[PDB]
Structure 1
């Protein structure tokens, strides 16, 4: 299943709480909370390049599924982990007490990051 494309953020939930619990500066949280930008996925076989607009920052990350990767987090911190496919439409990984699920259903990509009882959910639509 092709994940490739550009996706417009439509709605999200718990941006503020989630950014607070990972330690993002309050200034950046205020500036970033209502920015609904475009994120992009470039897939090539098992390799993925993610360019993610989140608040006032754009972060680039890549990985090959199944292989270990180094990911840059929102605070800038770097973490070792691995990303796996769960089925044909779901990308799942974990780091820094966070479980992340990225599911693509047609033109809608749902991203759910759970940290404690905070569920940071982002819904985006293919453009």
Structure 2
């Protein structure tokens, strides 16, 4: 068939690195690109094609129980050893990551339709807001 319409999810990607390297893509872009899965949405009627491709990489995965200290290696991010403790403060989830960096941790809370995540390291604070889908 010539019909390529639809939503296509990547399941393998062989030698993307060498193809991008032949196109002189910068090292740091290639390092992340080879970790991305692609989703291609193709719309085709007659000779006319529209292709929308999105790339996603699995950015951080962590399991924990509130109140139970655990060692983790911040593999994915900075790759350090911390001893993390997550506790409730009211309805706010509070995580302290004890280790090399001072004031390292995060807070997560819900307000209505929105999840708020405050990330801290040193004197830097990152505020993120997510909408429930």
| Highest RCO, 1 vs 2 (Cα 8 Å, sep ≥ 6) | 1
TM-score (norm 1): 0.50
Structure number with larger C-alpha Rg: 2
